Design a protein around this nucleic acid. Structure first.
Ligand SMILES: [K+]
Ligand SMILES: [K+]
Ligand SMILES: [K+]
Ligand SMILES: [K+]
Ligand SMILES: [K+]
Ligand SMILES: [K+]
Ligand SMILES: [Mg+2]
Ligand SMILES: [Mg+2]
Ligand SMILES: [Mg+2]
Ligand SMILES: [Mg+2]
Ligand SMILES: [Mg+2]
Length: 1277
RNA sequence: AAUUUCUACUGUUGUAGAUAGAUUAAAAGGUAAUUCUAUC
DNA sequence: ATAGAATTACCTTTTAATCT
């Protein structure tokens, strides 16, 4: 049976690259190493990285210079801001155009500034690095000027020593300017006025300007609604350095001073936040900073906002949180906050540890006692009540809470005890309501008090126990006992030290960095442990430490001795951070590097004419393919003379002919002064060329006036191009077969025909003896292009990439090209990265995961490919070369779907916590044909659960981050797993004439297990060019005629809700809805007030108990509530039990019995079937409405699941026509067996609505509003 | 337990399926340490 | 014991440009 997508073949051209191994042939590798080419290119990669760093320093200076010259007027900024805020409340077209114009005028200002500078003329051309003898290069001039001045550009750079080495490096790349072409293209994107995020124009205007305006709005709104939020005096003291600016752009005053927050948020002063320095200032104003030697961190705006929010208990203030500005496009980032030193190697770590612990061991206080003995005696005297508890204090911070949790198993015991004691002491009368002065005194004595005396704690606890029960009361002796056990910790530490003794010697060598290796895990596990132990001790002592308040009267001997000890111990904080920062690094791994073979243009073009200049040639021998690179000194090996002289049977050399960019190439050859006389152009053809009458918008020659386009002129010009092509020496051999000139309506059509037909591969036979000679002498370097399919023992279906490569040269492809070979291929070298461990030696039994054992005559080495040095070949090709990219691809897909809508199915896919992905196949009527999870994707005998695999990897990564172990990759597992899912989905799409449907949510999931967006992206990519290896070479679905069922997808930003056959529906109410009735919970019952909740409950029609069915019925009409988006009359029932997730753990809740208990407690009679709605609305108790609303929510919770188990079911609170309530546990085959299945099925129903809109359609919209969705789903059936 | 490379394999010097590279920039998130605070 | 707002350090993944 034929597929409906048979027509969608060869629809648009796309680009791919294939990857192969290069296997050196004969003496090739010997000659390579003899000349040391691999060494040369290894050094050149390092030099190239350095050169790019140097160019980047020049670019950073240029950017700072431009942004220092730039000034954006306050009027432009205010106009932008006004239109920008007006855009928020309306989508009108005039506002869109006005915003576009303001954005573009600001961009134009900055773009003029960048064009004006002199350096910009030579910023991306050859003149940067290499110039002639007359003038030196701009980069070299800037380096020499910087050296002449007192500035050392490469102090921060570790790879470059000084500017003299920088000069060496730039001078070494003379004659290699083309090597930087691409890089310079990258750099052009930094200054482009187009809407590309790589530009500083973009970063200022598209990114940072809206953030600053939003922050200014938030600042003024906060000033109105929370004036007491930010402490302006303190923030001006703390952040003076970042509030200092030279120029107030509102008043134009060139005065350097500390700005007010009012000034920093004046719109014009946005001019101060364009460069990286001002960006860091502004972001520091938002974020505060740590200052070396100050124990308290200085606060920014957001911290004052959050503290005030916590103070007055208003979470609405979270709305006014400031947004950090994004960095400037090439800037090195400077931190205003403190930055810790760095340990260099293993020896640093071990020596610093040993110094710390020897210091802690040998230390003695003024009372000549060790830390251990001293703390022991101190806490023993404390235990024995020998000290004045009114002169010893606990910090009233998290340390006291931690103590309460550790000793009384409740963090709030000590705090509430002290609050009750101070409340009872300051005001015995009016305990519930303190006075206006007593409230401030209370809070100042407890909440505001930095420290609390042990006296206060003890008396508070003793008064607290009176009103506490006997089984659970908290005694001060328990706190004293906790402190008396602390010295023992020291002894425990001792043990580890001796063990670590040995460990120290292991890593006492310097420069080794062996602690970053995985083999050191065990030893690291010890180190961390010791550190962790010490750290914990520190915190247990931290509660006594007094911060930088240098006031309360204290036992001065106690505190002298304690602070001596604590100061010595507290060096563990820096040591801990240093060691963590070192060990967590991932160890250095070699990367592959580019091979050039002494050629800056090694594979930039395969054309025969370019062979001596690019030196890359392709050969075919039997069924094998070969890449050959000519020695730079011997690049005439395959000139025409040698080919004629050495015609032989051995190798088939590819001869490559390409006529690219016809619109520039043809007139370059025909009107060039060298040959313009040859292709004799008439005066009329020259008149067509001079005034561009053959084009609508082309440029005229020699400054003539452009004449209106004339199709007759265009066709005569096309005919001159044809005549000239036939006169041309090399192009005549393309065998062009143009359509009739009268068929053309545009010059571009003819150009496209030229470019389509202007690619031809042919072959020349060459003596094997000649290839062997030239590869032996070292004049040719020869490699076989290889993957596992070219093995003599392959004997199976090949890789898709193998098929594409072979099709490049297939007779059937060459007669009408779909696979075209492109230029700018690349060669790489990859050094061996793991030791060759022979994992399964020959003639030994090996265990099978599914025969129970296997044996082989040969060895089997794990990761053999990484146990030796290898060459690689990245080769770019174009597929569907003669067709062009179709803008109207979605429209054609929709036309096809409208014609054959009866054959169409809906493959809808949802995600879940329990299911990585879950699919639902729906027929045109809305019935479910298929449904299964994608967690298990092992077909046939072997089944693999990639959900468990991915969840295990996630747990492993969490464990690793915590334990300083190497974080293993989860990305490769997700890609290998999704390949199978994509395969299955393609198969389904074609077997069932399906369209795929997903839900709208971007890129911020933070559940490492989740795979939804990656699956979308991989599926789009696959459906761009769908080949089935089992199809026929020239039939639909084969190599020449692949399915194209999706649009190209350049970005997600561009992509709407349809790419080809993949549609997106809103995720709203896809899984929290009934599959039978369509009921959805748009009553949102929350408890606010008694008046509000009785107002709510009076909107129902009736509320009663049903005896004949034994459950409560709430009947209502959705029209009586806020919005008519959901409409209709519904009766909901307390039928069935529910599962509640709390802290996770789960709980069985029976709502009918809870409703019974609540009605008995308030003595409302329901037992005879009476309607109790009036009695509900008349109740006055807060608790009644709170519990009623809670039970009503529980009734509406259709998704019920126990976390940590399989069950995730869905029960409806609405009964069907037969009186049954849907439950996924006992649901028919055509019904969703699962909550996630329900989500998939309703995503599919939204897709079915879309199919309907396609079938019945000009101006087709795939926007699905909730109203139409509800009407569709719950209307019938 | 072999790979252009990934995943699952042993399917026997390999078997399925997938596989757009190079370069450049930026963002997002995770974990720890530290600061100030809020919680029935 | 949860958690919020910051800073620093280490890490992985994702997205969007240029060319092919
Ligand atoms: K400026
Ligand atoms: K102010
Ligand atoms: K590590
Ligand atoms: K490779
Ligand atoms: K497939
Ligand atoms: K893959
Ligand atoms: Mg001005
Ligand atoms: Mg060259
Ligand atoms: Mg194969
Ligand atoms: Mg290149
Ligand atoms: Mg493997």
């Amino acid at each position: 049976n034929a597929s409906i997508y048979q027509e969608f073949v060869n629809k648009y051209s796309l680009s791919k690259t294939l990857r192969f191994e290069l296997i050196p042939q004969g003496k090739t590798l010997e000659n390579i190493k003899a000349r040391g080419l691999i060494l040369d290119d290894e050094k050149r990669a390092k030099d190239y990285k350095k050169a790019k760093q140097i160019i980047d320093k020049y670019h950073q200076f240029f950017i700072e210079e431009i942004l220092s010259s730039v000034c954006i007027s306050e009027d432009l900024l205010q106009n932008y801001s006004d239109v920008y805020f007006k855009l928020k409340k309306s989508d009108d077209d005039n506002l869109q155009k006005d915003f576009k114009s303001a954005k573009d005028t600001i961009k134009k200002q900055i773009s003029e500034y960048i064009k004006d500078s002199e350096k910009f003329k030579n910023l991306f051309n050859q003149n940067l690095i290499d110039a002639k003898k007359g003038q030196e290069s701009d980069l070299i001039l800037w380096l020499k000027q910087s050296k002449d001045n007192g500035i050392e550009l490469f102090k921060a750079n570790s790879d470059i020593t000084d500017i003299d080495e920088a000069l060496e490096i730039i001078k070494s790349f003379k004659g290699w300017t083309t090597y930087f072409k691409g890089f310079h293209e990258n750099r052009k994107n930094v200054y482009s006025s187009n809407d590309i995020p790589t530009s500083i124009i973009y970063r200022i205007v598209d990114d940072n300007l809206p953030k600053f305006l939003e922050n200014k709005a938030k600042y003024e709104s906060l000033k109105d609604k929370a004036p007491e939020a930010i402490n302006y005096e303190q923030i001006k003291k703390d952040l003076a350095e970042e509030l200092t600016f030279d120029i107030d752009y509102k008043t134009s005053e060139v005065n350097q001073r500390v700005f007010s927050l009012d000034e920093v948020f004046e719109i014009a002063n946005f001019n101060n936040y364009l460069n990286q320095s001002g960006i860091t200032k502004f972001n520091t104003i938002i974020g505060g900073k740590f200052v070396n030697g100050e124990n308290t961190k200085r606060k920014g705006i957001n911290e004052y906002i959050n503290l005030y929010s916590q103070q007055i208990n208003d979470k609405t203030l979270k709305k006014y949180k400031m947004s950090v500005l994004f960095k400037q496009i090439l800037s090195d980032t400077e931190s205003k906050s403190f930055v810790i030193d760095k340990l260099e190697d293993d020896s640093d770590v071990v020596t610093t540890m040993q110094s710390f612990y020897e210091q802690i061991a040998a230390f003695k206080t003024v009372e000549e006692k060790s830390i251990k003995e001293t703390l022991s005696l101190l806490f023993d005297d404390l235990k024995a009540q020998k000290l004045d508890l009114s002169k010893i204090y606990f910090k009233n911070d998290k340390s006291l809470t931690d103590l309460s949790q550790q000793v009384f198993d409740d963090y709030s015991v000590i705090g509430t005890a002290v609050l009750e004691y101070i409340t009872q002491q300051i005001a015995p009368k009016n305990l519930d309501n303190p006075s206006k002065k007593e409230q401030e005194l209370i809070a100042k004595k407890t909440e505001k008090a930095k420290y609390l005396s042990l006296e206060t704690i003890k008396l508070a606890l003793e008064e607290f126990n009176k009103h506490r029960d006997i089984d659970k009361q908290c005694r001060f002796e328990e706190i004293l006992a906790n402190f008396a056990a602390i010295p023992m910790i020291f002894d425990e530490i001792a043990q580890n030290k001796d063990n670590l003794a040995q460990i120290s010697i292991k890593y006492q060598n310097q420069g080794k960095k062996d602690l970053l290796q995985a083999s050191a895990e065990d030893d690291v596990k010890a180190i961390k442990d010791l550190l962790d132990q010490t750290n914990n001790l520190l915190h247990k002592l931290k509660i006594f430490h007094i911060s930088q308040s240098e006031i309360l009267d204290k036992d001065e001997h106690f505190y002298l001795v304690f602070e001596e000890c604590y100061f010595e111990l507290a060096n563990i904080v820096p040591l801990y951070n240093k060691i963590r920062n070192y060990i967590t690094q991932k160890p250095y791994s070699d990367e592959k590097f580019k091979l050039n073979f002494e050629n800056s243009t090694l594979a930039n073009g395969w054309d025969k004419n370019k062979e001596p200049d690019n030196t890359a040639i392709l050969f075919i021998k039997d069924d094998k393919y070969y890449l050959g690179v000519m020695n730079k000194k011997n690049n005439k090996i395959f000139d025409d003379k040698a080919i004629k002289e050495n015609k032989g049977e051995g190798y088939k050399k590819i001869v490559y002919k390409l006529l690219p960019g016809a619109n520039k190439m043809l007139p370059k050859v025909f009107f060039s002064a060298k040959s313009i006389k040859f292709y004799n152009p008439s005066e009329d053809i020259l008149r067509i060329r001079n005034h561009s009458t053959h084009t609508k918008n082309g440029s005229p020659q020699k400054g003539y006036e452009k004449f209106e386009f004339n199709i007759e002129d265009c066709r005569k010009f096309i005919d001159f191009y044809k005549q000239s092509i036939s006169k041309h020496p090399e192009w005549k051999d393309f065998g062009f077969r143009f359509s009739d000139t009268q068929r053309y309506n545009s010059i571009d059509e003819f150009y496209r025909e030229v470019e389509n037909q202007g690619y031809k591969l042919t072959f020349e036979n060459i003596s094997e003896s000649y290839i062997d000679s030239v590869v032996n002498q070292g004049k040719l370097y020869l490699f076989q292009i290889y993957n596992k399919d070219f093995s003599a023992y392959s004997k199976g279906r090949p890789n898709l990439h193998t098929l594409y490569w072979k099709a490049l040269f297939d007779e059937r492809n060459l007669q009408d090209v779909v696979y075209k070979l492109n230029g700018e291929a690349e060669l790489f070298y990859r050094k061996q990265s793991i030791p060759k461990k022979i994992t399964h030696p020959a003639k030994e039994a090996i265990a099978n995961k599914n025969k129970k054992e296997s044996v082989f005559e040969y060895d089997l080495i794990k990761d053999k490919r990484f146990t030796e040095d290898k060459f690689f070949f990245h080769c770019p090709i174009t597929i569907n070369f003669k067709s062009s990219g179709a803008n109207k691809f979605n429209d054609e897909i929709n036309l096809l779907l409208k014609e054959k809508a009866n054959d169409v199915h809906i493959l809808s896919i949802d995600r879940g916590e329990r299911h990585l992905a879950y699919y639902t196949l729906v027929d045109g009527k809305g019935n479910i044909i298929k449904q299964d999870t994608f967690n298990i994707i092992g077909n046939d005998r072997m089944k693999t659960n990639y959900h468990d695999k991915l969840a295990a990897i996630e747990k492993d990564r969490d464990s690793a981050r915590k334990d300083w172990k190497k974080i293993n990759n989860i990305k490769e597992m997700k890609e290998g797993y999704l390949s199978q899912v994509v395969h299955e989905i393609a198969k389904l799409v074609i077997e069932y004439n399906a369209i795929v449907v997903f839900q709208d949510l971007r890129g911020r999931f933070k559940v490492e297990k989740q795979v939804y967006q990656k699956l979308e992206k991989m599926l789009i990519e696959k459906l761009n060019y769908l080949v089935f290896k089992d199809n026929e070479f020239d039939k639909t679905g084969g190599v020449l005629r692949a399915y194209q069922l999706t649009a190209p997808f350049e970005t997600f930003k561009k992509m709407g809700k349809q790419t080809g056959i993949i549609y997106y529906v809103p995720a709203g109410f896809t899984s929290k809805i009934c599959p039978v009735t369509g009921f959805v919970n748009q009553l949102y019952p929350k408890y606010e007030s008694v008046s509000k909740s009785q107002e709510f409950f009076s909107k129902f029609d009736k509320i009663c108990y049903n005896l004949d069915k034994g459950y409560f019925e709430f009947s209502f009409d959705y029209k009586n509530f806020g919005d008519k988006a959901a409409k209709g009359k519904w009766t909901i029932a307390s039928f069935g039990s529910r599962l509640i997730n709390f802290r996770w753990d789960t709980r069985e809740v029976y709502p009918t019995k809870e409703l019974e208990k609540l009605l008995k407690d308030y003595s409302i009679e329901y037992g005879h079937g009476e309607c109790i709605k009036a009695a509900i609305c008349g109740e006055s108790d807060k608790k009644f409405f709170a519990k009623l609303t809670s039970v009503l929510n529980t009734i509406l919770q259709m998704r019920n699941s126990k976390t940590g188990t399989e069950l995730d079911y869905l029960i409806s609170p609405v009964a069907d026509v037969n009186g049954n309530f849907f439950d996924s546990r006992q649901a028919p085959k055509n019904m969703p067996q699962d909550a996630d299945a329900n989500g998939a099925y309703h995503i599919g129903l939204k897709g079915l609505m879309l199919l309907g809109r396609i079938k019945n359609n000009k101006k087709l919209n795939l926007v699905i509003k909730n109203e139409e969705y509800f009407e569709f789903v719950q209307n019938r059936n």
